[PDB]
Amino acid sequence: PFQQFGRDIADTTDAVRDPQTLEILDITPCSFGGVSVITPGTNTSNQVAVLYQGVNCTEVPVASNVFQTRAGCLIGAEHVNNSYECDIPIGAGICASYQTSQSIIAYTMSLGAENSVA
Amino acid sequence: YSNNSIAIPTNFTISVTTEILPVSMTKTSVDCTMYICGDSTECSNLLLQYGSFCTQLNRALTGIAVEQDKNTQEVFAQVKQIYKTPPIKDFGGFNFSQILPDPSKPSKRSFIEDLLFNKVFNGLTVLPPLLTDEMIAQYTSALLAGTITSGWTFGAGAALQIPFAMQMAYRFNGIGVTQNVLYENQKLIANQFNSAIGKIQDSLSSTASALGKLQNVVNQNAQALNTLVKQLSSNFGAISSVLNDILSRLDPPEAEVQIDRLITGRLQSLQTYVTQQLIRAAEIRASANLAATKMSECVLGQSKRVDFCGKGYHLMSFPQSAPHGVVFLHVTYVPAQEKNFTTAPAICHDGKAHFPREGVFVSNGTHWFVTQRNFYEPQIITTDNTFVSGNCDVVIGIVNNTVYDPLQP
Amino acid sequence: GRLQSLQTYVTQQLIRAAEIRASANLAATKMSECVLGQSKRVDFCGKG
Amino acid sequence: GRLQSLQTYVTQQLIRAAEIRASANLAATKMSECVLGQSKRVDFCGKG
Amino acid sequence: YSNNSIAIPTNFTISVTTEILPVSMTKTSVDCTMYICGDSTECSNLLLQYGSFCTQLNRALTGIAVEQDKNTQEVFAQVKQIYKTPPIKDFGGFNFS
Amino acid sequence: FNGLTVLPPLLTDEMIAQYTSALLAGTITSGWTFGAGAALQIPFAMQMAYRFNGIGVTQNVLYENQKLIANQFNSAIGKIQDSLSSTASALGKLQ
Numbered sequence: 001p002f003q004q005f006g007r008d009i010a011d012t013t014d015a016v017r018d019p020q021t022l023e024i025l026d027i028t029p030c031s032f033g034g035v036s037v038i039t040p041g042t043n044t045s046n047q048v049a050v051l052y053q054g055v056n057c058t059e060v061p062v063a064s065n066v067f068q069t070r071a072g073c074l075i076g077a078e079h080v081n082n083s084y085e086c087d088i089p090i091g092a093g094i095c096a097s098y099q100t101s102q103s104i105i106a107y108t109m110s111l112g113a114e115n116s117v118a
Numbered sequence: 119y120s121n122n123s124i125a126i127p128t129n130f131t132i133s134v135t136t137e138i139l140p141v142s143m144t145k146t147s148v149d150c151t152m153y154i155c156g157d158s159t160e161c162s163n164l165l166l167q168y169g170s171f172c173t174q175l176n177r178a179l180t181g182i183a184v185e186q187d188k189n190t191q192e193v194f195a196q197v198k199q200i201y202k203t204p205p206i207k208d209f210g211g212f213n214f215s216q217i218l219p220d221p222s223k224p225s226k227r228s229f230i231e232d233l234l235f236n237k238v239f240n241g242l243t244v245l246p247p248l249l250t251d252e253m254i255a256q257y258t259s260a261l262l263a264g265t266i267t268s269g270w271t272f273g274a275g276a277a278l279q280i281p282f283a284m285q286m287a288y289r290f291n292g293i294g295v296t297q298n299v300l301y302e303n304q305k306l307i308a309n310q311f312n313s314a315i316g317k318i319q320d321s322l323s324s325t326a327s328a329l330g331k332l333q334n335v336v337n338q339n340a341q342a343l344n345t346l347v348k349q350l351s352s353n354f355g356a357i358s359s360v361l362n363d364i365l366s367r368l369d370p371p372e373a374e375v376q377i378d379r380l381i382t383g384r385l386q387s388l389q390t391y392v393t394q395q396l397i398r399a400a401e402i403r404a405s406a407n408l409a410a411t412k413m414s415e416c417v418l419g420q421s422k423r424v425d426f427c428g429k430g431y432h433l434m435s436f437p438q439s440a441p442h443g444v445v446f447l448h449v450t451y452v453p454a455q456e457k458n459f460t461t462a463p464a465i466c467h468d469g470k471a472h473f474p475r476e477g478v479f480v481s482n483g484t485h486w487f488v489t490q491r492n493f494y495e496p497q498i499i500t501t502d503n504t505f506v507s508g509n510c511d512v513v514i515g516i517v518n519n520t521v522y523d524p525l526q527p
Numbered sequence: 528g529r530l531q532s533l534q535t536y537v538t539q540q541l542i543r544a545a546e547i548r549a550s551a552n553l554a555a556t557k558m559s560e561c562v563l564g565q566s567k568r569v570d571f572c573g574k575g
Numbered sequence: 576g577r578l579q580s581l582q583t584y585v586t587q588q589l590i591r592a593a594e595i596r597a598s599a600n601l602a603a604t605k606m607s608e609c610v611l612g613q614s615k616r617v618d619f620c621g622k623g
Numbered sequence: 624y625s626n627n628s629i630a631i632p633t634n635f636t637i638s639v640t641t642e643i644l645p646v647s648m649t650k651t652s653v654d655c656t657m658y659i660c661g662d663s664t665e666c667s668n669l670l671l672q673y674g675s676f677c678t679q680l681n682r683a684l685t686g687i688a689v690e691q692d693k694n695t696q697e698v699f700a701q702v703k704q705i706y707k708t709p710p711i712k713d714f715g716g717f718n719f720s
Numbered sequence: 721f722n723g724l725t726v727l728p729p730l731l732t733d734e735m736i737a738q739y740t741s742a743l744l745a746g747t748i749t750s751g752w753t754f755g756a757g758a759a760l761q762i763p764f765a766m767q768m769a770y771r772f773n774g775i776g777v778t779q780n781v782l783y784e785n786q787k788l789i790a791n792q793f794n795s796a797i798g799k800i801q802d803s804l805s806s807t808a809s810a811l812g813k814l815q
């Protein structure tokens with residue numbers, strides 16, 4: 001009852017109490033991250049995809065095909081359901097490549113051929 | 119010690135020992151402008167006068183993250199294909215249930231891997247590893263299946279199948295013990311192997327400080343980040359730590375100079391953090407190179423290097439995954455239950471000296487035999503297991519005795 | 528400012544030199560074992 | 576000034592300690608393989 | 624070199640060579656507050672506002688010291704027991720004195 | 721001393737000498753057996769025969785040249801003493 005605001009281990013304010021109505025509010029930092037451009041090379045095409053690292057796609061238009069991964073949200077790549085060898089590593093087991101009209105895809109990494117010794 | 123006595127083991131023991139090696143550390147990337155001052159435009163404008171003091175740090179951290187991914191890739195990704203153990207698991211008595219994957223669990227990790235896994239912003243972001251834990255477990259399972267089904271072959275060309283009993287016979291022959299020793303003691307050796315693995319699981323479950331290195335790495339990274347965050351909120355000799363008050367309740371000149379001093383302090387803190395991270399990453403890369411070498415030499419083959427792959431005479435090793443690290447289970451052959459004997463450099467039969475082709479002369483006390491140097495299986499001295507060179511005048515310690523010859527019908 | 532820049536350059540050069548020295552030690556070992564002999568170590572002197 | 580001097584000394588000591596640790600690891604390996612065994616690695620345990 | 628000639632030794636030589644490796648360095652520890660200003664209270668008060676700068680250096684130096692101890696321990700302590708040579712030393716002509 | 725101190729090493733020099741002497745005694749008496757399990761005794765002539773056999777030379781080469789090889793070993797050790805005593809720059813790395 002006598003406490004006003006909360007703190008985490010690193011002495012960063014993460015909760016406050018509204019002075020008028022005695023309710024607890026949770027403070028969350030405004031979303032931020034890096035922007036990564038995925039390109040197959042100018043010698044092949046001029047089409048690129050954009051990755052926003054560690055950011056939800058909901059906050060993306062605030063500041064083509066939308067796909068949300070663990071490393072962030074992939075804008076401009078079509079998620080296939082196959083699995084090939086890693087051409088361009090994105091993160092968390094996701095790789096991108098330029099396959100065939102012509103588009104940039106984003107599959108899941110394949111760990112090589114399947115084998116079973118007799 | 120004496121000049122004519124030798125001790126030779128009459129039994130053996132199969133011992134399994136673990137080994138923990140960190141291979142990678144968490145990939146953190148820290149922005150420069152956001153950390154120094156993430157909301158004050160004039161502070162960023164002032165910081166712009168320092169040149170490229172914010173691009174070098176980002177480049178270094180990016181290089182460190184790439185290094186971590188490369189470390190994991192080179193340590194674990196060493197198989198061209200993904201091998202699989204057969205559904206029938208009759209390996210002649212050897213029981214690999216503790217290391218083979220468990221399909222019942224959702225994560226498809228083995229027993230020991232589960233034990234290991236359970237046992238173990240002001241502009242800072244933590245990037246995810248490129249290889250998820252399931253892919254690391256898949257690599258580990260592929261290595262285990264290839265080692266169990268094939269042996270040496272799958273790491274040096276086309277994978278070739280061979281029964282596990284015969285693979286173990288080859289590995290025994292590779293340390294100086296014949297095949298009949300394994301073939302005549304298969305059940306005892308299998309029981310010893312299973313008991314050793316069970317003891318390994320129990321020991322890993324009981325002691326709470328076995329996985330010390332990975333915890334050390336995690337704690338060091340966390341402490342560095344916490345120290346950086348604490349250093350963020352310091353005055354550095356200015357009026358107040360927060361620069362919002364400095365820009366509000368002060369004239370532009372004095373506020374500017376205080377902001378400059380705060381910028382210098384925070385830049386020094388960031389530089390120290392980056393330097394420490396670089397040194398720690400170099401240490402981790404050395405450890406990851408060692409782990410990759412051990413995987414190549416102990417897991418994909420049999421190593422004659424002493425004390426490298428375990429403690430004793432190396433037979434085989436099994437990799438196991440761990441959070442930001444790898445764990446090996448070095449199976450080794452240790453002799454036990456020695457017995458005193460009397461030795462002799464050679465034997466004088468018919469005026470000519472006789473030396474053993476392979477082995478050593480020993481004595482019950484009255485007779486003489488030829489036995490292996492590592493295991494005690496005496497056998498009668500014969501022409502086929504000895505070779506003749508010179509007469510009986512130059513060897514210092516020759517013993518008069520008689521040798522037998524097969525050609526006597 | 529210039530002293531800070533120079534000191535940062537020197538520290539980076541020192542760490543890079545340590546890395547290159549480790550690589551040179553590895554190359555010397557590979558020359559000693561692979562070239563002057565025939566290694567039985569797996570995957571050291573090539574694949575096979 | 577004195578803080579800068581101290582941090583420079585500490586950084587140089589850390590790099591030197593890393594080099595010494597690499598040398599100590601090499602010494603431990605040579606003790607394990609040359610002394611307690613008989614190495615087949617060329618030019619590792621002496622010349623010859 | 625010719626396609627039918629081979630050279631084979633007829634004798635040998637037992638050669639002994641030395642090799643020197645440094646395994647550890649001197650364990651030092653420098654206090655921060657005392658080194659910067661060991662007796663000035665005003666100086667210590669001013670330094671206290673710089674944050675945790677005298678803790679990181681002490682932690683690094685302590686890590687270096689324990690690393691040196693571990694280096695010596697791992698290089699030398701490799702025998703479980705302490706073996707002793709027999710009092711009478713007749714090793715077939717080899718002299719290890 | 722301006723606030724700098726030098727801690728003493730945990731293992732004293734006599735303890736390091738004791739480790740080195742134990743290693744030497746184990747090597748002379750046991751061979752390589754003491755580093756991989758129970759220590760098994762063996763005559764030094766026979767251990768050197770094993771070590772000769774390990775590099776592709778038969779045992780009779782040692783057994784028929786034991787005195788010459790022993791003399792060569794002794795002369796080599798004496799030369800090591802002389803070389804270390806005369807040249808004072810050999811210990812470059814520690815210095």
Ligand SMILES: *[C@@H]1O[C@H](CO)[C@@H](O[C@@H]2O[C@H](CO)[C@@H](O)[C@H](O)[C@H]2NC(C)=O)[C@H](O)[C@H]1NC(C)=O
Nearest residue numbers: 001002003004016017018019020021022023024
């Ligand atoms: C501060 O004043 C506001 C405005 O009157 C209070 O909010 C009202 O509180 C009464 C108390 O029973 C409620 O019945 C009303 O429904 C509230 N109105 C609204 C719009 O929320 C508030 O409680 C006061 N806070 C304190 C600590 O006294």
Ligand SMILES: *[C@@H]1O[C@H](CO)[C@@H](O[C@@H]2O[C@H](CO)[C@@H](O)[C@H](O)[C@H]2NC(C)=O)[C@H](O)[C@H]1NC(C)=O
Nearest residue numbers: 128129130131132305306307309310313454455
């Ligand atoms: C080698 O040691 C094993 C023990 O590790 C011996 O096996 C034991 O033998 C006794 C009597 O034969 C049994 O009561 C035990 O149950 C056995 N233990 C195990 C684990 O099997 C074995 O006999 C020894 N070999 C020789 C030749 O003495």
Ligand SMILES: *[C@@H]1O[C@H](CO)[C@@H](O[C@@H]2O[C@H](CO)[C@@H](O)[C@H](O)[C@H]2NC(C)=O)[C@H](O)[C@H]1NC(C)=O
Nearest residue numbers: 207208211212213214215216229312313315316
């Ligand atoms: C391999 O060993 C494991 C454990 O050491 C065996 O699993 C045990 O099986 C019995 C009988 O079903 C159970 O009572 C135990 O609880 C099991 N242990 C564990 C840890 O789950 C397994 O049966 C062995 N392999 C074979 C083929 O028998």
Ligand SMILES: *[C@@H]1O[C@H](CO)[C@@H](O[C@@H]2O[C@H](CO)[C@@H](O)[C@H](O)[C@H]2NC(C)=O)[C@H](O)[C@H]1NC(C)=O
Nearest residue numbers: 480481482483484485486487495496497498499
């Ligand atoms: C010397 O070796 C012989 C051969 O093995 C041992 O004599 C055997 O002893 C067993 C048990 O008493 C008998 O069953 C065999 O018939 C004996 N064979 C021969 C050829 O004598 C003898 O025990 C050994 N010496 C010692 C001191 O143990």
Ligand SMILES: *[C@@H]1O[C@H](CO)[C@@H](O[C@@H]2O[C@H](CO)[C@@H](O)[C@H](O)[C@H]2NC(C)=O)[C@H](O)[C@H]1NC(C)=O
Nearest residue numbers: 633634635636637785787788789790791792795
């Ligand atoms: C192999 O070399 C050794 C010396 O390294 C030779 O021994 C020497 O022989 C000469 C000739 O008789 C003597 O004058 C020396 O005093 C010997 N030196 C030693 C240390 O004994 C040996 O003769 C050579 N082998 C052959 C077959 O000639």
Ligand SMILES: *[C@@H]1O[C@H](CO)[C@@H](O[C@@H]2O[C@H](CO)[C@@H](O)[C@H](O)[C@H]2NC(C)=O)[C@H](O)[C@H]1NC(C)=O
Nearest residue numbers: 711712713714716717718719720794795797798
């Ligand atoms: C091993 O070599 C040493 C050094 O040559 C021998 O020690 C010498 O022994 C003689 C014999 O009385 C003495 O006159 C010398 O003074 C000794 N030298 C030193 C430096 O002490 C030693 O005797 C040899 N070992 C054996 C078993 O003879």
Ligand SMILES: *[C@@H]1O[C@H](CO)[C@@H](O)[C@H](O)[C@H]1NC(C)=O
Nearest residue numbers: 078079080081082083105107
């Ligand atoms: C891929 O799989 C998901 C889940 O089964 C499914 O919803 C989606 O339609 C699939 N896409 C294609 C192209 O098959």
Ligand SMILES: *[C@@H]1O[C@H](CO)[C@@H](O)[C@H](O)[C@H]1NC(C)=O
Nearest residue numbers: 119123125455456457458459
């Ligand atoms: C061999 O003889 C020595 C002589 O004292 C003795 O100490 C040792 O225990 C004997 N070996 C065994 C295996 O009993």
Ligand SMILES: *[C@@H]1O[C@H](CO)[C@@H](O)[C@H](O)[C@H]1NC(C)=O
Nearest residue numbers: 120121122514515516713715
């Ligand atoms: C062993 O030493 C004893 C005396 O110590 C001696 O009588 C015997 O001849 C020696 N034997 C050998 C083979 O050296």
Ligand SMILES: *[C@@H]1O[C@H](CO)[C@@H](O)[C@H](O)[C@H]1NC(C)=O
Nearest residue numbers: 466467469510516517518519
């Ligand atoms: C061995 O036999 C030969 C011939 O019978 C003899 O000359 C020699 O003295 C014998 N050796 C011993 C040690 O009795």
